[PDB]
Paper text:
This reaction is catalysed by a guanine nucleotide exchange factor (GEF) eIF2B. Here we have determined a cryoEM structure of eIF2B in complex with the GDP-bound form of eIF2 phosphorylated at Ser51 on the α subunit, which sheds light on the molecular interactions between the two molecules and provides a basis for understanding the regulation of translation by eIF2α phosphorylation.
The map obtained using a linear mode dataset only did not yield a high overall resolution (5.7 Å). To further account for the different conformations of eIF2 in the complex, we also carried out focused EM data classifications using combined dataset without applying any internal symmetry and we obtained another four density maps (maps A to D in Supplementary Fig. 1), however, at lower overall resolution. To separate the different conformations adopted by eIF2 γ and β, we have applied two masked classifications. In two of these maps (B and D), we also observed in proximity to eIF2γ additional unknown low-resolution densities that could not be attributed to any region of eIF2 (extra density in map D). The extra density we found in map B would be in a similar location with respect to eIF2γ as eIF2B ε-cat HEAT domain in the structures obtained in57,58, suggesting the possibility of nucleotide exchange on the opposite side of eIF2B hetero-decamer in yeast.
Residue numbers in the entry:
A (entry chain B), B (entry chain A): 4 to 305
C (entry chain C): 10 to 108, 113 to 128, 147 to 376
Write the structure that this text describes.
Amino acid sequence: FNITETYLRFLEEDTEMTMPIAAIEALVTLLRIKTPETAAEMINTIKSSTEELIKSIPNSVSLRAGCDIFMRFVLRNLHLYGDWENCKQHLIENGQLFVSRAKKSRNKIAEIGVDFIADDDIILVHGYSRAVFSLLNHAANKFIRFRCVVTESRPSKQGNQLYTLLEQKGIPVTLIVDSAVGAVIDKVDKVFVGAEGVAESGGIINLVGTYSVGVLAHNARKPFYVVTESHKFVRMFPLSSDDLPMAGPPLDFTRRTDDLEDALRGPTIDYTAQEYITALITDLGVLTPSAVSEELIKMWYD
Amino acid sequence: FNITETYLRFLEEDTEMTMPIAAIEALVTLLRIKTPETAAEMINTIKSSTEELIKSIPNSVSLRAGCDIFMRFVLRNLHLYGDWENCKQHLIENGQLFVSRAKKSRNKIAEIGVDFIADDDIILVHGYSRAVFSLLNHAANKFIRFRCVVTESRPSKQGNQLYTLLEQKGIPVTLIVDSAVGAVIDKVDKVFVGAEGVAESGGIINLVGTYSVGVLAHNARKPFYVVTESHKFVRMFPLSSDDLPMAGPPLDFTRRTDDLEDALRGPTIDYTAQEYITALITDLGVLTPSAVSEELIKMWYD
Amino acid sequence: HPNAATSDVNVTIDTFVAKLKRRQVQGSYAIALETLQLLMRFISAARWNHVNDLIEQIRDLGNSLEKAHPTAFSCGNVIRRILAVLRDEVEEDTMSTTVVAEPLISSMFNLLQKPKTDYRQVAIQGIKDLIDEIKNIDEGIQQIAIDLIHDHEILLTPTPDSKTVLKFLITARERSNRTFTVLVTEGFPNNTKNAHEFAKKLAQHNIETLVVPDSAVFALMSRVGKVIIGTKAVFVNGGTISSNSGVSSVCECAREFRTPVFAVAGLYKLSPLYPFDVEKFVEFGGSQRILPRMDPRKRLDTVNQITDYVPPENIDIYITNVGGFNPSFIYRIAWDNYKQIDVHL
């Protein structure tokens, strides 16, 4: 009963919702039509829907991660081996319940995460993730000595947007180009990066440039930070230094031109290794080193 | 008579006139009017003019280097203890002669120092220098397996200009953002760079982002190269990682604005350390390790 | 929660506080023992009727203790362990009272999905078990510890303040087939006397001892084989608090030279709380010990600290009584000893 349309429906919304959360909700809604009782009629349909979504996907792995998590949850659900109605009801409940959860997670974050701020520490923020922004705003709320540094990101002018968002807060800020980020090593005390997908080992999928930043941090011995909630978990491991399922160009040397038509071709999404990250920020208590892998193991058991 | 006016006179032409050579020519022209026989009336005035030029500078470094070189040359000239007329005449001759020399130097560079790219070595070029471009074009002329990778330069969209220049030569090119530069070091063999000036310590005075690139190169052990015409040796010492005599602001934290006005004030000039250089290509022989410093010593006799 | 409820039932809390504040109690082990004793006293004397309420009370007490002294991690840890022990039993009981499937020992989805007995004796037993664990750590290390050091290898020892590390060294030195040269860094404002004592002990043991000043670490680094830390407290991500002075720089040096960095402590020192700030947990020493006079010393503001914090990037090995572990793995060990809700009190 459609899912692509639902996905499309969320573009100018957000800020209050959460794309992957929305997707999950949509999935749940789809599920509560074709009966969760008959497993043959339902699971296959769900799979088909997921395939369709993948086909319609441009540059996103997080939705897939969400859907597989949902599937896993569903599978777990039927372990009670009792009546087939209560379980169904629970499943039905668990969609808006997921939406509700996000708020609670945020709340949890905003009380433990505020302990990290030290006296006169300058913070650089990279990537458009809602969680990081929330953390920042709720740190301002707490009233702690802090500074904000903006990086000039170029997918569809994201850095500028981030800067603008920061402005409507009242915090003094300065914009730095992604090429010029290397020179800033002593002034910025902590390097903060948001994530779009957390892998097996603890590797991060995000945006236009993260790996380089990580490398720089390693070189300067400055702490590297990953800020996320709890829905972006993929059972994946990259083969090379940077490899992802992409709809865009993986390094394309364009043919001989004069009038300029196609030139903007290359890497858009980047992967960073486990060694670079020193601290991980999540709502599930406090966990850092290799907890994601453990979580995955718990989930899949395979 | 003015030097500033002369400098202004060249705008749309360039692309072979080595700006410093033009400056030297202008200086010579200024000199050969008010009798170069007297040292009291002349050298002081020249110095004053140079000071004025420095004061008037918008965003240029090499002028000073040129002027000091000229001064040194002048000093060298009057060591023959012969006569005032002939020496003066020789000095006068040596302005246009110097300009003439530059072309020969360029030719020497383009015929001898082009052997680095031969067996389909993929080049990562950043920082616009005429010499590097000449080397490229004259390599195409010679016919050799070669491939180009372009990193996006953003002072006032110079990357686009570079791309256009490349186009009028016939060769497939691709654009890479200096954020995803850490992701792509695998297929690209060697890194080549055009510099604004070479420091007393050995390091390179360049553009919007080079230090990070250097760091990346160091990490990857893929060699870092600098190709410049041998007259960019200024008496300047960048003692710390984030210090240079710059006309622009060095990381200015702007106040809390609302209309998004003050943002684009990111570091447009960056410095890298002495150890990063593997080979420095100059017309005065293939010399790198501590050659610039030696030259400086020879000049100042100290 | 104030001390209005506990006045005639339990009095020793005040004494414990006093011990903490003026530093009458010394050595983390002793603190842990004291904590255990306190817990025992609480258990034997007080009344409960309800279980959840009791748990809450315990949590409150723990919080109060933390508020009284933050640098006493062992105290906290022991309490947490006890809580964990209680919790499992409580969970078991609930299942019988009411009258479940799990892929592993603990599940993540169980938090999302909606979920009188003789537990006192079990609780009592837990304390005893903890005490036993505290008693012997070195016996569970030496079977792994005396396998790493080889003939004609040179050791470098920062922090000789810890009692376990010395013992570990001694056990290695016992073996007739094994021979090694020992370089000892002093640590001026906090570790000097202790270092001297350690050196003396080494001499007594009949081993080649080299007393090295804090400046002469760089010259001998071409010969250095291994690095051992005398740490006091272990944490979640891998980072450790060391037993006072001269650890960080040495570790950095080791990292630079790619020298292996070992750590010996124990799981009772291991904490389920994160060290988010260095400034919050690390306590500073005394200015009086460094330089005499007072009136010119108003101008001369001297900086000196007790404890030292080392990042998890430098340290690679954490051998305990159970076995050899990593900073990327030790979190799980903590979880196996302290439960999920017991982290925040």
